[PDB]
Design a protein around this ligand. Structure first.
Ligand SMILES: Nc1ncnc2c1ncn2[C@@H]1O[C@H](COP(=O)(O)OP(=O)(O)OP(=O)(O)O)[C@@H](O)[C@H]1O
Ligand SMILES: Nc1ncnc2c1ncn2[C@@H]1O[C@H](COP(=O)(O)OP(=O)(O)OP(=O)(O)O)[C@@H](O)[C@H]1O
Ligand SMILES: Nc1ncnc2c1ncn2[C@@H]1O[C@H](COP(=O)(O)OP(=O)(O)OP(=O)(O)O)[C@@H](O)[C@H]1O
Ligand SMILES: Nc1ncnc2c1ncn2[C@@H]1O[C@H](COP(=O)(O)OP(=O)(O)OP(=O)(O)O)[C@@H](O)[C@H]1O
Ligand SMILES: Nc1ncnc2c1ncn2[C@@H]1O[C@H](COP(=O)(O)OP(=O)(O)OP(=O)(O)O)[C@@H](O)[C@H]1O
Ligand SMILES: [Mg+2]
Ligand SMILES: [Mg+2]
Ligand SMILES: [Mg+2]
Ligand SMILES: [Mg+2]
Ligand SMILES: [Mg+2]
Ligand SMILES: [Mg+2]
Ligand SMILES: [Mg+2]
Ligand SMILES: [Mg+2]
Ligand SMILES: [Mg+2]
Ligand SMILES: [Mg+2]
Ligand SMILES: [Mg+2]
Ligand SMILES: [Mg+2]
Ligand SMILES: [Zn+2]
Lengths: 7, 870, 350, 4, 4, 176, 4
């Protein structure tokens, strides 16, 4: 998992 | 914004397998949940001026300007605090970048997940992100001093938990080699490896360092005596116990060029290196006299100071040490030369760079005066002046790698010194003019043997090439060809974990190994109980993994432990997933079955590529995990014709199926029968399908991990959960062609527990002894209706000892429900579970089964004896 | 066993065996004793912490750094029957074993206060003091230790009873006989006063009065061999303790009312792990049978089937010794071994 | 000690 | 020391 | 070897065997009466083979293994006559008729009744015991130029470990 | 035989 996304 | 709950995860988890170190903060956006950035005037300018570094955050606009481009378009706060906590850690040198947000519970409560380096620093940064963010949505800015003090606290928190550089060096190489490591609670020790293969280190001391060698190395006379008896060159010298006998000692030693050391040790203190005159002998004495009361008046030897590192009776590295100094680099004074070279980019602070700073002090002056110089004097071209008596990188000196320049005879001698003293890892202090010639030609000497030497000068030299010092250390602790880990078999799934875990531990135990295991009942090692109570989760797994006697670990793994703190082991050999079911949904923020499957799949995804995942082919969510697994996959089923199994064995996979009354293993085209279901005691005569499924899972796990079939047969045949051994769980009574099964029930699940035998019973009559006690709400009619639809020999006992509901009223509701649905099931009413209904089983005809749900199992299992059960 | 031995010039060490097969000992420490295990065993908090994390029963207690926090510690521990030890070690000194009242807590504190600054206010456990010896992760011997005492052997006073038993032929001096002498001193009196007795009082038939707070053969106590009476579960636990700490040769101090029952049934505890324990009480017990303690030690140092010596080829005669010696050393050297030799010219190795 |  |  | 069983053939020898039993090819048998058409059992002559591997008594297992060791065979077939393989041979008065070197496997890997057995697996386990290699290291060198030079140097380096090194080149084949 |  894979970064700072709140998509 | 309020923080309701915080979790610290340490190991593979729900959010990520690789991101082991995470903080999950449950944040309540009482305000702000209704205000997506543009509803908060000032929340852009205040955010960017307080933390301008946020321009480096991408977010899902996967480009450099993404955060700060999604901050104009409206964003809710529970998502911003996640980019502030990550940045506050980056601002103090701790690198973290992963993070996620999800909405939970009632609207406004979010799970904010972010990466940490240090555990307390991470939690601190989270709380700080909330304060920073709350002030900026109240007012338009954040006081500078309220940011600077927080950054100072994070810098200290991350310093206090740091490992020293010699431990970082060993640990880093251990990770490269896949050796697991743990900190221990006592004396700053680190454990390397699991179970019986564990080793311990403490900085530069290890589990192989003997006490006698270490104490001898700290005794200067003992060291000198033992080495000169071995024919090893040491300096000539004597002892004075603080008497003015200096004038005599000098004459035995051979003249005035002498060295005077303090009688006891105090690091590099109280030492005069080159006494040339009587008045110097006196000054040297006065300094030696400061410490406690034969290291007095040694002959002075000429040469450089070399440090030799020997690890397992073998040479690893050699470096030449030179004291802080300046040279006649043009017609400049010493204070000018110092400022010129103390600006070198490779110098500063400490463990920050290769070299530290040169400091002029009264001691630099004292050293310079003895050479005929002081700070305001000009040096002749290329003249060298020392600012220190001894060489140390921490005082501004240098270290030159000379590892490849050491003569073969000198290599032999250094290794012999380490063996004579008895040290595994040793530093040897050598004085010589030329390390490339034998010490006997240059008249060199060995000055000291040092136990637990540091590594900085060899791994970070100022001149020459760096050496991998850790590699020779790990090679003695974990020699090539040996393991650092013990097998781990992890069992999970919604139901059947405890049963599968005990059987699998039992099978391994038949090989004669020490087997440790954890369950919801207790922690055990070889049938001894270590701890009692619910011992699932990472705290218990660590008891077994740190235990020096354990050869095999079998661990039941629950969702509670995974969701609260991750897995304790990182990787395993066998991962077994038994099933996924809608049980405990709504707890722990897992609301759906698809989410529960992601919690259980954590085990399948941590199985080492050389290992196996054991999946249930009769379960649609479990079989589907096979496509995430990097490991080999084995399957089990209760139906040999399951298309998954057939496709798999046709490609030479391994599967376990129930067929022709047998539990068997399919290995490609070959079939291996283990045993008959009816002859395995845990299986209720072959009428409890889930007991068969659990036996298949345990047999398959043992098989894929290398156990022979004969061992597996012995283990399934001798395994027990006997009545009055483990009373209270499925106690089956075979009374010839008469049957009864005693278990406990409250809600429908407990009734179902024996309802399964009834559905599968090969006989004539199906009865039951009561059901609920006074622990139930008024669902007695419904439970009565259920019994009516299951049984044709239903006898009422609902007047128990507890009497939480008057007397027979509980039975009266059962009677209405049982007669309502099936008014013809031998509805006798006794209302006595102590001397009558669990005795009067002779009211039921041949091949009749009576289901028993007593308020007290221990008592019912005894009264049923009236009919002579096996 | 025909193992050669030598004294070494440093630190009272003894070498056992020759060349590459040599081992060293120093009293009860050996070449196989690790430093980390030994230092941990000397750290009372470290030992307690590491053992309770392993699920091993230890006494309940806390720490006070010489402040009057005694009144609070007692409440976490569980009541007044407590033990107060000096914060640092000084052998068997400054220790109060059974505090029953507040004023005793104060006196105990004042003695503890004599040493340097969590061994304060432990719960007091009942039972006998047993010493268990474990050598290579395996149990060797168990003995029960009892403090110097006299009993109501007729209607005699304590000073009369002491003279009667202190004449026993098995008592005297030190390492001269099995037992030493009982000495009445101010400390015997202090111990007797706490029991309601003094030297001129008469004891009821078969009443026992202790003249010492603790058991030690050197102070006139006794040691009873109980090696064959220890329960299998307790054997397992003692071996596990030695392995957790990391000691090869270890003494374990156990308090229990019955060594023949599991410690969990008798509510017994492990009080201390001792590195480098002595052997006198096991090789010369006052009751029971003596044990050969050394044999298990030599078996780990020189395991069955291994040599303790290297080949020695000695050459003599009036003429030709040096020539014969150099040739013979040369021939052995062609096998790839390390060969040492001495001659009239020099001492050589390879 | 030497002899604990 | 720890680091001699 | 096309199917599990072969065909039953009536010939003068089937008749000779039937005559000794009181029957011939045109006679009717009583219900469930059995008549043999051959003196001995062989799958290639139309007989059958029934797997009885799990029905053999522990004492008989011990005795069969002892027979193979006394004779000195690794792979051996033992011909046993008994009324009940599930009882000790001493109770049923059974005997061992013959030890056969180099026995075939068809009847065990393709039985007509019962479950097939993986007979080869125990053979390969003695030849290549668990934990041992079946291969030696192979270092293959290719490319347009420099193969011979690289090959001789690499062989030379391996040789300094004291092992037997074989190599091939455009000049010759060498061993040590 | 070859195949006894
Ligand atoms: N006889 C000698 N002749 C020449 N140089 C010596 C002699 N003895 C000691 N030195 C030098 O003086 C220094 C003193 O080292 P020492 O043996 O006393 O250990 P130490 O100073 O107490 O502890 P540390 O290693 O941390 O400085 C070393 O740098 C060594 O090179
Ligand atoms: N697939 C299954 N395997 C075993 N038991 C099952 C299964 N399905 C339903 N059950 C019933 O539920 C009970 C589960 O007991 P068990 O302890 O073995 O599972 P568990 O995982 O340890 O539960 P827990 O999460 O509380 O530890 C059994 O008594 C049985 O009656
Ligand atoms: N919590 C306790 N409950 C009951 N008895 C205890 C307790 N703690 C210590 N003792 C007893 O008191 C004595 C004190 O032993 P201690 O642990 O303090 O080592 P020490 O006295 O400092 O050194 P030494 O072993 O030489 O006497 C022992 O005999 C032990 O049996
Ligand atoms: N039997 C003999 N073997 C060898 N040398 C002999 C013998 N007899 C006479 N000699 C002569 O005497 C000399 C003895 O030399 P050698 O060193 O080998 O004996 P040695 O025992 O070492 O004398 P030393 O007692 O002084 O050591 C030789 O040089 C040789 O010339
Ligand atoms: N990369 C290279 N390595 C070695 N030789 C090279 C290379 N490039 C050009 N040469 C030249 O070509 C010759 C190649 O000789 P070499 O035998 O080692 O290669 P080769 O592969 O064995 O040729 P062949 O296919 O005929 O066996 C050398 O003498 C050298 O002069
Ligand atoms: Mg030094
Ligand atoms: Mg030093
Ligand atoms: Mg559960
Ligand atoms: Mg469980
Ligand atoms: Mg003690
Ligand atoms: Mg002690
Ligand atoms: Mg002579
Ligand atoms: Mg000679
Ligand atoms: Mg034959
Ligand atoms: Mg034949
Ligand atoms: Mg070519
Ligand atoms: Mg070629
Ligand atoms: Zn974001």
């Amino acid at each position: 998992d894979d970064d700072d996304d709140d998509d | 914004m309020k923080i309701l709950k915080t979790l610290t995860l340490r190991g593979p988890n729900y959010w990520s397998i690789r991101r082991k170190k995470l903080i999950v903060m449950r944040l309540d956006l009482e305000d702000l949940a209704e205000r997506p950035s543009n509803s908060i005037p000032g929340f852009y300018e205040g955010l960017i001026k307080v933390l301008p570094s946020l321009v480096e955050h991408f977010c899902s606009p996967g480009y450099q300007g993404g955060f700060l481009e999604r901050v104009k378009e409206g964003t809710y706060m529970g998502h911003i605090v996640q980019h502030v906590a990550l940045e506050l850690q980056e601002l103090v040198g701790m690198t973290a970048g992963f993070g996620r947000t999800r909405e939970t519970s009632t609207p406004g409560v979010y799970n904010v997940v972010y990466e940490y380096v240090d555990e307390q620093a991470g939690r601190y940064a989270g709380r700080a992100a909330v304060r920073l963010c709350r002030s900026l949505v109240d007012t338009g800015d954040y006081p500078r001093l309220e940011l600077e003090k927080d950054l100072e606290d994070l810098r200290d928190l991350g310093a206090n938990s740091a490992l020293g550089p010699s431990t970082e060096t060993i640990v880093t190489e251990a990770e490269a080699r896949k050796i697991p490591w743990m900190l221990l609670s006592a004396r700053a020790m680190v454990q390397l490896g699991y179970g019986v293969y564990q080793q311990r280190i403490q900085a530069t001391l290890s589990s192989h360092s003997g006490i006698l060698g270490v104490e001898l190395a700290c005794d200067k006379e003992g060291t000198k005596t033992i080495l000169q008896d071995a024919g090893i060159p040491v300096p000539r010298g004597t002892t004075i116990q603080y008497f003015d006998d200096l004038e005599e000692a000098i004459n035995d030693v051979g003249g005035y060029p002498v060295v005077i050391k303090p009688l006891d040790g105090n690091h590099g203190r109280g030492i005069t290196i080159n006494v040339r005159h009587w008045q110097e002998a006196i000054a040297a004495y006065d300094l030696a006299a400061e410490e406690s009361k034969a290291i007095i008046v040694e002959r002075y030897y000429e040469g450089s100071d070399h440090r030799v590192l020997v690890v397992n009776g073998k040479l690893v590295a050699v470096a030449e040490r030179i004291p802080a100094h300046v040279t006649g680099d043009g017609s400049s004074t010493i204070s000018e030369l110092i400022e010129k070279t103390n600006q070198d980019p490779n110098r500063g602070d400490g463990h920050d760079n290769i070299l530290t700073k040169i400091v002029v002090n009264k001691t630099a002056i004292d050293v310079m005066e003895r050479q005929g110089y002081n700070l305001d004097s000009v040096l002749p071209k290329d003249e060298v002046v020392y600012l220190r008596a001894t060489a140390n990188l921490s005082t501004g000196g240098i270290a030159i790698d000379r590892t490849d320049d050491i003569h073969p005879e000198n290599i032999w001698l250094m290794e012999r010194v380490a063996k004579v003293i008895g040290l595994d890892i040793a530093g040897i202090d050598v004085v010589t003019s030329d390390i490339s010639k034998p010490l006997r030609e240059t008249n060199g000497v060995i000055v000291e043997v040092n136990a637990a030497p540091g590594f900085r000068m060899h791994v970070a030299p100022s001149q020459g090439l760096p050496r991998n010092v850790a590699a020779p250390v790990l090679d003695m602790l974990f020699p090539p060809g040996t393991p650092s880990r013990i097998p781990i078999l992890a069992v999970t799934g919604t139901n059947g974990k405890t049963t599968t875990t005990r059987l699998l531990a039992h099978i391994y135990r038949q090989t004669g190994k020490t087997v440790g295991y954890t369950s919801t009942d207790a922690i055990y090692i070889n049938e001894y109980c270590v701890e009692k109570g619910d011992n699932t989760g990472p705290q218990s797994a660590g008891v077994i993994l740190r235990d020096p006697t354990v050869e095999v670990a079998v661990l039941e793994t629950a969702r509670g432990g995974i969701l609260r703190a991750g897995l304790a082991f990182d990787s395993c050999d066998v991962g077994v997933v038994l099933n996924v079911a809608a049980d405990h949904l709504g707890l722990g923020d897992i609301d759906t079955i698809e989410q529960m499957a992601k919690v259980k799949s954590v085990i399948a995804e941590v199985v080492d590529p050389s290992g196996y995942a054991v999946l249930n082919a009769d379960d649609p969510l479990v079989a589907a995990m096979a496509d995430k697994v990097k490991a080999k996959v084995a399957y089990f089923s209760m139906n040999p014709d399951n298309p998954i199994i057939q496709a798999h064995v046709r490609r030479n996979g391994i599967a376990a199926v129930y067929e022709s009354g047998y539990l068997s293993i399919l290995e490609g085209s070959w079939t291996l029968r283990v045993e008959q279901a009816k002859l395995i005691p845990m299986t209720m005569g072959g009428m409890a399908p889930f007991m068969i499924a659990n036996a298949l899972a345990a047999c398959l796990a043992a098989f894929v991990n290398g156990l022979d079939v004969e061992v597996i047969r012995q283990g399934v045949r001798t395994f027990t959960t006997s009545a009055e051994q483990t009373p209270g769980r499925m106690n089956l009574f075979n009374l010839g062609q008469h049957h009864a099964l005693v278990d406990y029930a409250h809600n429908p699940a407990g009734y179902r527990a024996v309802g399964d035998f009834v559905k599968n019973w090969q006989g004539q009559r199906f009865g039951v002894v009561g059901g609920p006690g006074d622990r139930r709400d008024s669902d007695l009619i419904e439970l009565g209706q259920i019994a009516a639809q299951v049984f044709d020999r239903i006898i009422v006992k609902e007047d128990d000892d507890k009497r939480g509901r008057s007397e027979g009223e509980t039975a009266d509701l059962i009677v209405k429900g049982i007669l309502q649905e099936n008014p013809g099931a031998s509805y006798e009413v006794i209302l006595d579970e102590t001397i009558a209904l669990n005795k009067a089983l002779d009211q039921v005809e041949e091949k009749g089964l009576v289901v028993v749900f007593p308020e007290s199992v221990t008592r019912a299992i005894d009264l049923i004896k009236v009919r002579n059960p096996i």
